[PDB]
Amino acid sequence: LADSKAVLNQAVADLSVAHSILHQVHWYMRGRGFMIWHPKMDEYMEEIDGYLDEMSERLITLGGAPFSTLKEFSENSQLKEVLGDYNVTIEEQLARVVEVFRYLAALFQKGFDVSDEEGDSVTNDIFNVAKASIEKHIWMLQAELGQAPKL
Amino acid sequence: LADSKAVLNQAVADLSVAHSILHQVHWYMRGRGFMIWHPKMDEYMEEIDGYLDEMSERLITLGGAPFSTLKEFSENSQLKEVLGDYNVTIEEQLARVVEVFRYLAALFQKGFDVSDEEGDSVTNDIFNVAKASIEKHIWMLQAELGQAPKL
Amino acid sequence: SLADSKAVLNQAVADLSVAHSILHQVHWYMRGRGFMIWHPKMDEYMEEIDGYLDEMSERLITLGGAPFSTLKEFSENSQLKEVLGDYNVTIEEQLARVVEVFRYLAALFQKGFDVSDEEGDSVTNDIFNVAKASIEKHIWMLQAELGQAPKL
Amino acid sequence: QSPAEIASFSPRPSLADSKAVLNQAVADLSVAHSILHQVHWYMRGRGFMIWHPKMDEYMEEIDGYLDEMSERLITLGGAPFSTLKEFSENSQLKEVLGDYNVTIEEQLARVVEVFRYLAALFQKGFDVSDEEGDSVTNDIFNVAKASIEKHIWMLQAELGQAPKL
Amino acid sequence: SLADSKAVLNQAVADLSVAHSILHQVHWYMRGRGFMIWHPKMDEYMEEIDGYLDEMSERLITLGGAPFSTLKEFSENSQLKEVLGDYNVTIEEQLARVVEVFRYLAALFQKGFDVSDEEGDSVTNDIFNVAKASIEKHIWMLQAELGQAPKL
Amino acid sequence: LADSKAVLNQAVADLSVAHSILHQVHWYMRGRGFMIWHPKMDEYMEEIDGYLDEMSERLITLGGAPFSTLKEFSENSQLKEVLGDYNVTIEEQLARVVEVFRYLAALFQKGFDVSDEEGDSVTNDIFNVAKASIEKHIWMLQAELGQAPKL
Amino acid sequence: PSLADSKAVLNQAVADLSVAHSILHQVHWYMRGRGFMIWHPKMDEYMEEIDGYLDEMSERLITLGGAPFSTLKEFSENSQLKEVLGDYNVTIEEQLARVVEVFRYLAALFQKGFDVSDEEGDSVTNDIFNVAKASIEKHIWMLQAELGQAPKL
Amino acid sequence: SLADSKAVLNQAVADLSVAHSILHQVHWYMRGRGFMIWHPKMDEYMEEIDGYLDEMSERLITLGGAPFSTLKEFSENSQLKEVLGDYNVTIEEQLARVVEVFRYLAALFQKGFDVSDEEGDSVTNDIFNVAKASIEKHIWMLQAELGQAPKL
Amino acid sequence: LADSKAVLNQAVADLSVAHSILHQVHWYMRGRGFMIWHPKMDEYMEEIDGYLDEMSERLITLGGAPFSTLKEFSENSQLKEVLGDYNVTIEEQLARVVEVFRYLAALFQKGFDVSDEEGDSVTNDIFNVAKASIEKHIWMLQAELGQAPKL
Amino acid sequence: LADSKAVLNQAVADLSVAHSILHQVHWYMRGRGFMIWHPKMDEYMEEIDGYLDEMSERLITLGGAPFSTLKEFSENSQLKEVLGDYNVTIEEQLARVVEVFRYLAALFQKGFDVSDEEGDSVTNDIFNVAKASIEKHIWMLQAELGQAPKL
Amino acid sequence: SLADSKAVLNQAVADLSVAHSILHQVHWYMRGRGFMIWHPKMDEYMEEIDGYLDEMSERLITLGGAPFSTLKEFSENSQLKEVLGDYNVTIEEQLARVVEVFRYLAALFQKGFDVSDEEGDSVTNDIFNVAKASIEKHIWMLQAELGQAPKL
Amino acid sequence: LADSKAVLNQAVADLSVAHSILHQVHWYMRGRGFMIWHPKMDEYMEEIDGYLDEMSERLITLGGAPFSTLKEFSENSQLKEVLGDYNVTIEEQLARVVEVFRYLAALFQKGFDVSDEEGDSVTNDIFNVAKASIEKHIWMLQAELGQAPKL
Ligand SMILES: [Ca+2]
Ligand SMILES: [Ca+2]
Ligand SMILES: [Ca+2]
Ligand SMILES: [Ca+2]
Ligand SMILES: [Ca+2]
Ligand SMILES: [Ca+2]
Ligand SMILES: [Ca+2]
Ligand SMILES: [Ca+2]
Ligand SMILES: [Ca+2]
Ligand SMILES: [Ca+2]
Ligand SMILES: [Ca+2]
Ligand SMILES: [Ca+2]
Ligand SMILES: [Ca+2]
Ligand SMILES: [Ca+2]
Ligand SMILES: [Ca+2]
Ligand SMILES: [Ca+2]
Ligand SMILES: [Cl-]
Ligand SMILES: [Cl-]
Ligand SMILES: [Cl-]
């Protein structure tokens, strides 16, 4: 189960960075739609926190060792962060979230595949459920942005 | 529509088609305002289901037989449905809902008049209460569209 | 690529819409001993069906599909058949009719399960699996009230 | 001297005005509550587990109508009947001794007949109030008539019949 | 002369019914400073009385008895006396009236306790003990409002 | 629906002043009964606020323009205010609330009559329901003062 | 010792409640016939109540210095109730009659518990049996009424 | 000893009453994209204003003062200006109006803080501090919707 | 019922002192187990307060006069208090609670007997119920201390 | 009371005696108004317990040792207790509560001053919040008694 | 036919019933530091075990099977062995016993997952996957309390 | 208000790292006490998140720009992270949390000081409330460890 543990830990790092990025969007948001999207980022952060709980606990349960320092999150995550900026528009902010979500969904697909190969059905299900809700958020964010989900 | 039972059945049919149109709007919606109006359509659907509950039950109680098949609903309703289209703008979608609600308000006024003439006070109140809430929604939808209610 | 998953999801949209209509008819026209228990039960079943429609229509949209969204489309595309309401149908007959609709839906869900699996769409696969599980549990209970085994 | 004291039969009845019908409702609802409670206690037969607690729900609904109508009567300056003697003597519903050997169909039919009477009384109260222009009282009777009639449909459906209002 | 538990339970059915009626009268005809607090309290007392009625009638039926279930039986079997409602009674007179009814109920509950105890019917015994405890607590509060000791 | 709109706006004005008077009674109350009636005035204010919501919204819904400045409320209201005074007795305060309520009940009856004549059944029901509740309050307030409702 | 009998009847109850729970579960599972929708979940309510008595009686036994039976074999061997294989063909009315019989037994067992604990001066244990008996007897009345009969306690 | 603390609390009583009236106007007359979220939001703001009114009026009465309690007193003592309701105002101008009212209240609360701090009335001082914090947080949000920095 | 009133009042005093001891244990607790037992003392204080409500109210209802000053509580209670001391171990603090509870249970048995002798069944049940729960706690505390209840 | 810890402990003692006095009032009350004031005393006791929680915990947190025996509360409190008396009038009882509350508010002001002096801002806030609420109660109690707060 | 899916569901009915009994024993006989947190935790574990029994027995009935439903059947078909209750067992030994019971259940659920997957009974397969996931999470926690790795 | 803003941002960084450390402790915990302290870390994280919300929001409100990347949190925080280790004893873990909390409390005192000095009363209150709760946790954590708070 080496690869299942590896992708779960990858998720630990990526979810940590994704939560940070979402927090930035939440904080620096400006433009029409703020009142609805500002708290929505908070909802998205709670959902990301949720996946982190599920995945980190599964990794520990499997005898793994979750990344657990900002240095490890940053260095292992494939997501890049930039300085907060109030001048970013609402469309740009939402587009950035969509792109973070597409990355997460692809990671979850890899997680699904890897765990399926090793026969780790519990881990497999964790990734399937997370991927489903994230893809649903992509649909809604894309709809707000006037586009098809284009998964 | 010669009596109370008849207008009640007309309502069962129109409310059923109205529910379907609302669902279409809910599903095919795209554009800024999606996050607010997509779930709002679900509230409107719940409200419509509520009137269908009141009116169908009253019809049954009066010894009537409610239309209870999609064919009957579609054929007896005076509302017309068209294929779903993601390209309809958010504002055109809301304008469509307003048209549907104006029709229902007029239907309810007719039910009010008919039941009143026949002295069916219970049925009369049902239409009055439904008309009141529907008209209030017309005001809010029109306001979002930057217009007066124009009842 | 997911065209078949999309088609079966849309098939479910049509069938679930017709099933909801049939359940409403049973709810309304029901008469006989047991009415007080089963009339409100139909409302629970309608909420359940609505839930499946939400899950499947949203997944279809998410996959880039276009859900049927008019009564004519639901009626023409659904394999279920509707009949005019009739107060003389017995309680047993009404429950048997619901069982028939539920067996059809359970069969439809197995089909959705199979198609999604074949196209590698695991999210859609799970949606059908969860819906099949709950609807089959209802068949057991309905059949039980009817003094019969589930006979899946 | 002192004023002579009139000695006459009460008679009356006469559901002349809103206050009179509201008070008639106070009496009829009180006896109806008692009858429902009897059906509740003496019920036996298949279906007991569902209809026994249902009578309790019907009792609560009756209690509610009693609250609305008695309070409106007081608000109008009336004096509600408030003794079992006044309830029993003024109500047109007839009570009999409780009996455990009545089928469910028979119990439910009795409730339906009690409800048909109340719906009729409510229609009378609606007509009288409307004629007097007492719109508040008018709405009270209309609302109670509506729910009571819905109950008749359900009870009748259990009995395998149409509402037949 | 209440021979057994069934007899005192049925006596309570009648007495609780009349007490409820009296409480309702006080609720309706109340006038004076304190109305805003005591008018609704009467409703609480009625609900409590209802509770005892539920517990005692159900126990009687469970024991194979037949509860009084008509106003005629309640009125005639009850020892409580009703009078026509009158808005000219003071708040303090109304409360004293309630205390009287409660003292009567408490005495009846003691009888039920003694009778059930002699019989060895501990279930019925507890019902009377519980009802008695709460009724006496109310007498204390009512009397306190009236500037008096409980004087049980 | 000229008159209906006019009496609805009259109510907007009167309900706004009535709320102010209730608040005064709430704040300046002193004497035995304070603990019960002080919080009760807050309940009354909420009910008045509720009628204000129903009536102003219906007026907007009908194409009207609700009074929405303190100047308009004071000048259009038939209710008169006086400086707060802690020396008014509890019973005088309650009598004051009763007079305000008798006025509103009268206004609601007029609103009912006007709306009924113009055939505005939704407006008519709003006034009827508000009158029903205000009159119940009058009975209770009078009962506390040891009097009959005297509607 | 002084409370040897109370402890023994509490333990007898632990065994009988455990087997009664098993029987109720069987009725819940194998039920078929008109009335299933109302009685199937009702059995679940009864199981919850039975479970509640087991909590009360086992805890009091432990509190008194006893050792509760806590293995299926002890439950089965000490209980006076007999179990039979599940059977879908038992009628709804036969199933309810069976529950009535189990309850009549529990009610009598609780009466013994009451008598024994009362004789030993264990008032706490006495009240526990009294409250349980009261509810089970109310259930016998309702089950019997559904079956068209008097409680016949 | 607390003359100025009482004066500023009473100033708040008038200003909050007028601010409430202005918020109600914005609530009623609002038209434009965003109505569905900002219309209800105005009711939230009105409830918060009511809250401040409750706190400040009660503190004033508690300190032995006499709160303004007539529309005339509110109107004449408040420094906020009201104008006739107008449906033709844009959503964005309505929100800009709300921001102005809030900037004013936040300034008044700062005055309330300074004055009460000067007289050593710590309870009153905390009331103004807590109120100022929330109003300021609302200014940030409103400004953000309007694409601007809070600019306190 | 002189004896029943007397034992009830004795309970008022002992429960008042027991509440103080429990509060002391709550405040001065130090050692492994603090996090679970500190809030537990709060639950015990609440239960004790409840018994005080029941017993003091019953005494008043019987025409008695409850002790209602710290002096009366201290002088009538058979429980002895000592100065708070952080040096007491968790296990000793729990053993002290057990000691107080054994006393309370013994007291309640005496109240049960006295009331039973005088025929005061209401008071009798109040003591029986309090005794039942206090003894259940003794079992649990003792179990935590690796011992049998030893009632 | 030379420091924050000393004044916090003084409050522990005074709050303990205040609770006892409020309980006495709750138990011995007789007279019109009982039904509303008897339960109100329970609310006040709950509020008093709340201040005790906050102050005792803060003292412990600062390294102090709270008074934790009835002897300490009674001897350290500046409040005096007398035997319960059913003949005290309702008004007299409420006036007694007012005097206890005036003492507590005065003590809280001293705690506020001492802590502010020592720079202990956390403790300072605790006294400020408690003073705010007790003064509010004094206003309502005085109001029921037909008087101004007279702080 | 789903022969083996039905057999493993019934094996679980037996094993869950015995596991519930063992957990109840640990619950009752527990003594030692940690009792206050672990005694009620056992109740939580029993409720969860109970839930799995509900799910698995219902699925078996739904599939046309016949759940074991007598203590004798549970005891004779279960692979778990029970011993007499003993208060002298330490807290840490009790938790270790629970871990052993849970390791067995987790293995049982893995077996049910594989068998159901083999036969194409995806509904049953999901039930076992869910149950296995939670039981394994508990093993991690229990082991952690015991100062050890999960060692699944 | 430059220094208030600076200390608020320092807190954003320190709170972010503190959250990460708490999470590590939560995940890697092993030893008797796990079942109570594992969930407790979750409560602490939630509380830490709350301060982050209050402080980041106030910083934005004052015209500041909050650190919003893991790199900034890690580089600006004075707290140091180490690789997760399952062998560390429970008592060692709790001692580590105490050290993080002692640092946070000192940080909040500094924040209180700079804001008081600048006249920024709102920010001052935020640090005061947060310092209060953190110090309360230090007492409990120390108590579990058999020690005085030693603030
Ligand atoms: Ca958050
Ligand atoms: Ca929906
Ligand atoms: Ca529905
Ligand atoms: Ca038929
Ligand atoms: Ca009832
Ligand atoms: Ca017959
Ligand atoms: Ca009532
Ligand atoms: Ca208010
Ligand atoms: Ca269950
Ligand atoms: Ca059969
Ligand atoms: Ca509002
Ligand atoms: Ca406490
Ligand atoms: Ca209390
Ligand atoms: Ca096989
Ligand atoms: Ca349990
Ligand atoms: Ca968390
Ligand atoms: Cl039939
Ligand atoms: Cl059958
Ligand atoms: Cl360790």
CSV table of C-alpha atoms and ligand atoms in Angstrom, one decimal, chain F residues 46 49-50 53, chain H residues 20 24 27 42-44 46-47 50, ligand 11:
chain,number,residue,atom,x,y,z
F,46,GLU,CA,-42.4,43.0,17.2
F,49,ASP,CA,-43.1,45.6,13.2
F,50,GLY,CA,-44.6,42.6,11.6
F,53,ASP,CA,-43.6,44.5,7.1
H,20,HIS,CA,-32.9,52.6,11.2
H,24,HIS,CA,-35.7,50.7,6.0
H,27,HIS,CA,-34.7,48.0,2.0
H,42,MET,CA,-30.7,45.6,5.1
H,43,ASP,CA,-33.1,43.8,7.5
H,44,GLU,CA,-30.0,42.2,9.2
H,46,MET,CA,-31.7,47.1,10.9
H,47,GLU,CA,-31.7,44.4,13.6
H,50,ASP,CA,-32.0,47.9,16.9
M,11,CA,CA,-37.1,43.5,10.5
